[PDB]
Structures are given as structure tokens and as C-alpha cells.
Design a protein around this ligand. Structure first.
Ligand SMILES: NCCOCCNC(=O)[C@@H]1CCNC(=O)/C=C/C(=O)N2CCC[C@](Cc3ccccc3)(C2)C(=O)N[C@@H](Cc2ccc(-c3ccccc3)cc2)C(=O)NCc2ccccc2CC(=O)N1
Length: 164
């Protein structure tokens, strides 16, 4: 069974609802497990309390920098960084869940949820899941973004975890 995880998201303290994500452990098990564990917080750190720090309408919503909150930080469950597992899955459309990075083999904790097909990221960012519920919440997040990526409200992952 591919793991299912959830993000409960707020904007300036107001709940937006829940996003449920299927993690494709059947294709990218190491990357899926990193994200699963960062949702549960079982290593003592993870996504709870962190923000969507870069949100660009008609592109993607990026989150997961729980150390620096600005797109420079984070860490994986495997040490600071881990290599690109594979590029099997493509950025096919809205709801794709993929690893942010700073170049090859720089996966940590930062991730993004696409709101469009982002084919120019294929082969550069490791796709590892998909939204199965709460795409409307993703669109709410997107609506607080801007062309620069700066957000107009503080978008926080209030809670997160695994659904079992
Ligand atoms: N129809 C047209 C629609 O088209 C719109 C098109 N725009 C597009 O395609 C654009 C075009 C190209 N600009 C960009 O690369 C934008 C960059 C940007 O904002 N920086 C602000 C944040 C910092 C920087 C630079 C920096 C500084 C310190 C350390 C590392 C890098 C730059 C960054 O690079 N930080 C990573 C994120 C990350 C992830 C993991 C780590 C890590 C840390 C610790 C341990 C392990 C890992 C560090 C940083 C970033 O943010 N990566 C960019 C990115 C993130 C997510 C998805 C996709 C993209 C590509 C994109 O954004 N591509």
C-alpha cells in the first residue's frame, strides 16, 4: 500500500482545510519515505509548523524549509541531503508532488505541489506523489501567492501526519 499523508493548512491562522497526498513508494520508495517521516515528525523534525514560503500562481506551491523558512534550508531524514532517486514520474499536471532542490542530488525536505503541468522540471526534480483530496485547498494556497513567490498571508502547515 502506497502511504497516504495529510497536510492541514492555515492562512494567518485561519484554516483552509486538508490536503491528502498519495506517496508513490511503489516507484520512489526512498523519497516517499522521507516525506512520510517528515509528515509524522518521527525523527523529531518535519513539516508541522512550517510554511509554504514560495507560492507562484500558475506554477506551484513550495514548502518544507523548516530550518530557514525561505527556500535555503531544511534537511532530509537521511542526513542533510540525498541523491535524486529516479526521474520516472513526470510533472504531468495539477496536484503533482515533487522535490524542490538546488541542482542535482540536493534533496532535503523542501517540496512543491504543482498547479499546472511543469514539464521543464522533468528530469530535474524527483516527482514522488500526487494530491488525491483537497486540490481546492491547494488552489486556496496558490491564491495567496504572487509572481515573485512572496505570499500575502503566512501559509502554515498547522498539522500533518499519516493516514492509516
Ligand atoms: N508557464 C510558465 C510558468 O513558469 C514559471 C517558471 N519558473 C521556473 O521554472 C524557475 C526558474 C529558476 N528559478 C529558481 O530556481 C528559483 C530559485 C529561488 O526561488 N531561490 C530562493 C531560495 C534559494 C535558492 C538559491 C539557494 C540558496 C541557498 C541554498 C541553495 C539554493 C534560490 C534556491 O534555488 N532554493 C531552491 C530550494 C532548495 C531545496 C533544497 C535545499 C536543501 C537544503 C538543505 C538540505 C537539503 C536540500 C536548498 C534549496 C529552490 O527554490 N529551487 C527552485 C524550485 C523549487 C521548487 C520547484 C521548482 C524549482 C525550479 C524553479 O523555481 N524554476
Amino acid at each position: 500500500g502506497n502511504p497516504l499523508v495529510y497536510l492541514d493548512v492555515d492562512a494567518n491562522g485561519k484554516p483552509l482545510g486538508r490536503v491528502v497526498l498519495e506517496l508513490k513508494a511503489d516507484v520512489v520508495p526512498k523519497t516517499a519515505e522521507n516525506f512520510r517521516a517528515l509528515c509524522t515528525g518521527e525523527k523529531g523534525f518535519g513539516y508541522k509548523g512550517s510554511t509554504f514560503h514560495r507560492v507562484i500562481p500558475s506554477f506551484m506551491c513550495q514548502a518544507g524549509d523548516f530550518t530557514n523558512h525561505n527556500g535555503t534550508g531544511g534537511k532530509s531524514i537521511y542526513g542533510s541531503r540525498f541523491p535524486d532517486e529516479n526521474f520516472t514520474l513526470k510533472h504531468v499536471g495539477p496536484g503533482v508532488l515533487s522535490m524542490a532542490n538546488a541542482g542535482p542530488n540536493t534533496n532535503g525536505s523542501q517540496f512543491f505541489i504543482c498547479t499546472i503541468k511543469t514539464d521543464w522540471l522533468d528530469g530535474k526534480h524527483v516527482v514522488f506523489g500526487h494530491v488525491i483530496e483537497g486540490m481546492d485547498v491547494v488552489k486556496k494556497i496558490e491564491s495567496f501567492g504572487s509572481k515573485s513567490g512572496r505570499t500575502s498571508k503566512k501559509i502554515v502547515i498547522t498539522d500533518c501526519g499519516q493516514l492509516s
